[PDB]
Amino acid sequence: HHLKSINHICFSVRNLNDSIHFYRDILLGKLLLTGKKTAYFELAGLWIALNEEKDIPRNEIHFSYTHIAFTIDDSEFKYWHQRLKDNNVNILQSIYFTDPDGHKLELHTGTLENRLNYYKEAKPHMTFYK
Amino acid sequence: HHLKSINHICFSVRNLNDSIHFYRDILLGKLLLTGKKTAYFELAGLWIALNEEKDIPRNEIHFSYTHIAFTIDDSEFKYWHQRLKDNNVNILQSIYFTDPDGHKLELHTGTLENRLNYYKEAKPHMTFYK
Numbered sequence: 001h002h003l004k005s006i007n008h009i010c011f012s013v014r015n016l017n018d019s020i021h022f023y024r025d026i027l028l029g030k031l032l033l034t035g036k037k038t039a040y041f042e043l044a045g046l047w048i049a050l051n052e053e054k055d056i057p058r059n060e061i062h063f064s065y066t067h068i069a070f071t072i073d074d075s076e077f078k079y080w081h082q083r084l085k086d087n088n089v090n091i092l093q094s095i096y097f098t099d100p101d102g103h104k105l106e107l108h109t110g111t112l113e114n115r116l117n118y119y120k121e122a123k124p125h126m127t128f129y130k
Numbered sequence: 131h132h133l134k135s136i137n138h139i140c141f142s143v144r145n146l147n148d149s150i151h152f153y154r155d156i157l158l159g160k161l162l163l164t165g166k167k168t169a170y171f172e173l174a175g176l177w178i179a180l181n182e183e184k185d186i187p188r189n190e191i192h193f194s195y196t197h198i199a200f201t202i203d204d205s206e207f208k209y210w211h212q213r214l215k216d217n218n219v220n221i222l223q224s225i226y227f228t229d230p231d232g233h234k235l236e237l238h239t240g241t242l243e244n245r246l247n248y249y250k251e252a253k254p255h256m257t258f259y260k
Contacts, residue, residue: 001209002158003174004201006136007238012195028132033246035256040242044133047242056195065142065186066196066233071134079131103196108137112170112177116163126165 008047011103016052018100026087044070069106138177141233146182148230156217174200199236
């Protein structure tokens, strides 16, 4: 009875139209549905749901404790960096950035296996499980 | 140049040992690595990274604006509800719950296609995109 797969991700956003431009044009996702306060995309094979909450305060820090990373090919790194820079995205083997509200996102060019093998060399006092 | 897939998710957590018990025993994920302040799992085919931040305030609301849903078979609904209840998990076609810190999670038994077809009947004033 294991969990089978990731099903979807949902984010609260302040302005649906700004978020549709981000997810669908900048990140090249597919818009599937809208309501007055909702939008669904398919991005990288993943269902993403957006819920508009116009009152999330803009003068406070939110979204600090989660990040979501998507896979790109290594060869596409400069393409994506330039695309995000040319669209004035907030940019902080990985590109770290935020959506228009501040949800933390990452583009990464490696696998979990790559990362484990990297840490076995770089951080050998970690404990690795079979 | 589309994004290829979801790569991983990272969460900040206050107590690594409490979170390892949650992700690995209660949710049946696989522990792959630990450090003093890090743990990696594979859960539902997804790399999840945990970063321990012992100072996230316990007396404030956090994690409000994101949720992550995992797929289960319809027939496993009562199994999972009972498993989470019997492990004193905070429970709020879906089961809504939190991890020990408050990260919002969901078990869902349907697909995006199912949901679109549901809304075409239940919420017919939404706009549906081909």
